[PDB]
């Protein structure tokens, strides 16, 4: 029926797997997924067996999760171990350098020493330590193994090639890749030190605790710290090499059976987890330590579906592993600010970007994606560097670790001005329609810039939420067009653009303008910025649908139930909305700034004609890359943080709506517990 083929790495893992199977069989229903144990010689073979459908699941160290996610294997993390305790869970652990008390040497005296590692490519045992020594390893750092093999005078590096790099197997002939050889893994590394083969062991902070129950034995060991002092093994908080992410169970990217896997594992932990006691324990075993799952784990968390490997790992870890395999050293270097790569939605923004590229002489580079969230993801993982975003998306970007760099200012051409307090957010209706008002929306037809945008969603939806106290907005309005919503909800029923309901330009009713047109053609209410009516009436917008429209044909909804002319936003708006802002990663914020400020000098408001020369803030269509009413990109004057830039009030408002999010990227960015 439903089977999970679990991949066990060699014999001891095979025996634990069998006990696991049989035990589960007792507690699950005759359908409940059943385990099948497939035995392979190494984690690598397991990765391959899963790609090829021979198996479905294997728990791996984060460094190997990175390996498993590459082509052509393409696997992804779907369940994660957590540590610490049930009530205060952590999805990271510490890499430490473990030594014997009294051997005296510090972190900077490893050259020549003998080393014990958990395995090639693993976080604590290889990635972190080797990554700190890299730059000062023997100049020909390729291949890495040969260099590491000359720096230490003998090692145990499970999984490495002993044929070509025999020194890496001096302390463990064969470099066997499984718990069948005694010096493998967290346990083996520890043993390699304890038996005196090696002088140092690269493990995690629990290792010594899980192998030596009494403080008095543990008193024989110390940790090496980054400042070249030693500290007792209890003080790992102040004397670790790095924090690294959790070990995770990986599965195929498509047809991986993640649901089964999660079902099994969730039940497994309900029955055989750390609290329970029994003949079978999931985090323990008489056949060894860290079999199938780490003994130090306290349970699992379902990994958010949007999260792939890079995202699961995060940017610093991934870059660290990247560098290492890429022999890139950041020795006393200078100037990564060659060109800024911009992320563009859909076709049009791409075209505009290309144009901006050519003309800059490649100072601006273009990457593209089909959604705002995908663009933010690209930037998170350095596939791109920068994009401009509405406040609502700036929130998501911030929860995902990006920072605001420069704000779009709409009120003045003096680019040295501080960022404005924000634009006005209004609700607009047709004068034709006599009955609609603020207190009347239930039932009507609505138009929104996009889900998650400030004027189109966050402001109006949150203010309505505080009224209806539930989240089925698609049941409050009868019908709508709120791009980025579920293809088959009511809220997509008014959309039109080729790509129906997409959160981009391929949806006609997308954006400030799109939502206005939506109002003109099918809706009863549009949620947009205050300047929208003016920008699209009076022949200022020459499209057929708007050329003859008149400002006088529309009104605004005031919170108090009344209606007013559009010229009255100031006294008849929903709220203020922080200006759109440019985002990047901390690493590249400065670069990004400077190149934007400079490019603005030749391509900003100043350009007298935009059909002759290139204009950043001018768009062939509407609002490509920047808002067309953008005047200046102004420095943030200390509001270099998304909480700081958006401001309390806005944060407080978006938070109140947290429970209705449907953002896959936001759940992803909020999974890790640090």
Q: How many CA atoms lie within 13 A of 460 on its CB side?
A: 32
C-alpha 125/C-alpha 115 separation (Å) is 10
Q: What is the CA radius of gyration of the chain?
A: 29
Indicate which of Cl ion, Fe ion, none lies near residue 61 (CB less than 5 to 8 Å, by partner kind): Fe ion
* Residue 395 known to bind ligand: no
Whether 464 and 475 have beta carbons less than 8 Å apart is answered as no
Give me the least distance between CB of 577 and Fe ion, in Å please: 6
Known binding residue 512? Answer is yes
Min dist. Cβ of residue 126 to Cl ion (A): 12
Among 15, 123, 381, 536, binds Fe ion (CB under 5 A): 123
Q: For the chain, how many residues are written?
A: 674
Token digits of residue 620: 């062939």
**Residue 454's binding partner out of Fe ion, Cl ion, none, with CB under 5 to 8 Å set by partner kind:** Fe ion
- Residue whose token pair is 């449907």: 662
Residue 537 interacts with, from Cl ion, Fe ion, none (CB under 5-8 Å by kind):
none
Restricting to residues 285-344, name those near Cl ion by CB under 5 A: 290
Shortest gap between Cβ of 580 and Fe ion (angstroms)? 6
Among 360, 446, 454, 663, binds Fe ion (CB under 5 A): 454
We find the least distance from the C-beta atom of residue 186 to Cl ion, in angstroms, to be 4
| Structure token digits, residue 238 | 């102040």
Tell me the CA distances in angstroms from 108 to 138, 156, 591, one per residue in order. Answer: 15, 20, 33
Q: Is 456 annotated as a binding residue?
A: yes
Structure token pair of residue 355: 């144009």
Annotated ligand binding at 658? The verdict is no
Residue 118 is assigned to a ligand binding site? yes
Smallest distance from Cl ion to CB 316, Å? 23
Residue 125 among known ligand-binding residues = yes
Backbone angles phi, psi at 100, to 5 degrees: -85, 135
Strands 479-481 and 445-448: parallel
Which option in Cl ion, Fe ion, none does residue 185 bind, with CB closer than 5 to 8 A by kind?
A: Cl ion
Report the site for Cl ion in 149-188 (rule: CB under 5 A).
185-186
C-beta separation of 546 from 512 below 8 A: no
Q: Which stretch binds Cl ion (CB under 5 A): 89-97, 169-177, 209-217, 282-290?
A: 282-290
Max intra-chain CA distance, the chain: 88
Part of the chain binding Fe ion (CB under 5 A), chosen from 69-77, 188-196, 449-457, 548-556: 449-457
The answer to whether the CB of 394 falls within 8 A of the CB of 404 is yes
Query: Binding site annotation covers 93?
Result: yes
91 or 490: CB nearest Fe ion: 91
Non-local CB neighbours of 38 within 8 Å, separated by 6+ positions: 5, 6, 7, 8, 49, 54, 55
Instruction: Name the one range near Cl ion by CB under 5 A: 238-246, 263-271, 284-292, 408-416.
Output: 284-292
Judge whether 563 is annotated as a binding position: no
Distance between CA atoms of residues 344 and 388, nearest Å: 9
Which residues have CB under 8 Å from 345's CB, separation 6+? Answer: 368, 369, 370, 371, 372, 375, 504, 505
- Cα separation of 220 and 50, whole Å? 42
Stretch that binds Fe ion, among 121-129, 166-174, 226-234, 465-473 (CB under 5 A): 121-129
Nearer to Fe ion by Cβ, of 60 and 615: the residue is 60
Out of 61, 199, 295, 452, point to the residue binding Fe ion (CB under 5 A): 61
- Determine the residue with CB nearest Cl ion: 185
- Is residue 63 part of the contact set for Cl ion (CB under 5 A)? no
Give the annotated binding-site residues for hydrogencarbonate.
118, 122, 124-125, 449, 453, 455-456
Residues that bind Cl ion (CB under 5 A): 185-186, 290
Residues that bind Fe ion (CB under 5 A): 61, 123, 390, 454
């Amino acid at each position: 029926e439903k089977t999970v083929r679990w991949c066990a790495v060699n014999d001891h893992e095979a025996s634990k797997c069998a006990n696991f199977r049989d035990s589960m069989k007792k507690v699950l229903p005759e359908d409940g997924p059943r385990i099948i144990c497939v035995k392979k010689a190494s984690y690598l073979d397991c990765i391959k067996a899963i790609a090829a459908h021979e198996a479905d699941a294997v728990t791996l160290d984060a460094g190997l999760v990175h390996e498993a996610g590459l082509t052509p294997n393409n696997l992804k993390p779907v369940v994660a171990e957590f540590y610490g305790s049930k009530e205060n869970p952590k999805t990271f652990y510490y890499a430490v350098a473990l030594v014997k008390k009294g051997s005296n040497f510090q972190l900077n005296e490893l050259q020549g020493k003998k080393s014990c590692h958990t395995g090639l490519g693993r976080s604590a045992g290889w990635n972190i330590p080797i990554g700190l020594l890299l730059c000062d390893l023997p100049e020909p750092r390729k291949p890495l193994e040969k260099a590491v093999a000359s720096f230490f005078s003998g090692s145990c590096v499970p999984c490495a090639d002993g044929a070509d790099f025999p020194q890496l197997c001096q302390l463990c002939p064969g470099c066997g890749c499984s718990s069948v050889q005694p010096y493998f893994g967290y346990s083996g590394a520890f043993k390699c030190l304890k038996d005196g083969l090696g002088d140092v062991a690269f493990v995690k902070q629990e290792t010594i605790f899980e192998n030596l129950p009494s403080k008095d034995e543990r008193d024989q060991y110390e940790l090496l710290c980054l400042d070249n002092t030693r500290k007792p093994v209890d003080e790992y908080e102040q004397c670790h090499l790095a924090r690294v992410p959790s070990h995770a169970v990986v599965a195929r990217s498509v047809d991986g059976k993640e649901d089964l896997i999660w079902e099994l594992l969730n039940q497994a932990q309900e029955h055989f987890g750390k609290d329970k006691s029994g003949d079978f324990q999931l985090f323990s075993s008489p056949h060894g330590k860290n079999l199938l799952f780490k003994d130090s784990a306290y349970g699992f968390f379902k990994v958010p579906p949007r999260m792939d490997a890079n995202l699961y790992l995060g940017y610093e870890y991934v870059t660290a592993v990247r560098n290492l395999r890429e022999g890139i050293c950041p020795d006393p270097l200078q100037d990564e600010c060659k060109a800024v790569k911009w992320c563009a939605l859909g076709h049009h923004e791409r075209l505009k970007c290309d144009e901006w590229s050519v003309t800059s002489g490649g100072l601006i580079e273009c990457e593209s994606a089909e959604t705002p969230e995908d663009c933010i993801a690209k930037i998170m993982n350095g596939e791109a560097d920068a994009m401009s975003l509405d406040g609502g998306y700036v929130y998501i970007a911030g929860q995902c670790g990006l920072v605001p760099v420069l704000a779009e200012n709409y009120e003045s051409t003096d680019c040295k001005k501080a960022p404005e307090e924000g634009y006005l957010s209004v609700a607009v209706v047709k004068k034709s329609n006599p009955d609609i008002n603020w207190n009347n929306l239930e039932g009507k037809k609505s138009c929104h810039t996009a889900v998650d945008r400030t004027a189109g969603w966050n402001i109006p939806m949150g203010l309505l939420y505080n009224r209806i106290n539930h989240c089925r907005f698609d049941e409050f309005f009868r019908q709508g067009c709120a791009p980025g919503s579920q293809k088959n909800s009511s809220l997509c029923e008014l959309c039109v653009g080729p790509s129906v309901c997409a959160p981009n330009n391929r949806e006609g009713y997308y954006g400030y303008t799109g939502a206005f047109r939506c109002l003109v053609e099918k809706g009863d209410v549009a949620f947009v910025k205050s300047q929208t009516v003016l920008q699209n009436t009076g022949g200022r917008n020459s499209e057929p649908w708007a050329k003859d429209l008149k400002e006088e044909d529309f009104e605004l909804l005031c919170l108090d139930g009344t209606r007013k002319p559009v010229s009255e936003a100031h006294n008849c708006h929903l709220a203020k909305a922080p200006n759109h802002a440019v985002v990047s990663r901390k690493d590249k914020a400065a670069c990004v700034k400077q190149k934007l400020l400079d490019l603005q000098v030749e391509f900003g408001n100043t350009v007298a004609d935009c059909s002759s020369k290139f204009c950043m803030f001018h768009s062939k269509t509407k609002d490509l890359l920047f808002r067309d009413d953008t005047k200046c990109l102004v420095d943030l004057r200390g509001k270099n943080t998304y909480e700081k830039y958006l401001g309390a009030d806005y944060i407080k408002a978006v938070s109140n709506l947290r429970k209705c999010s449907t953002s896959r990227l936001l759940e992803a960015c909020t999974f890790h517990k640090h």
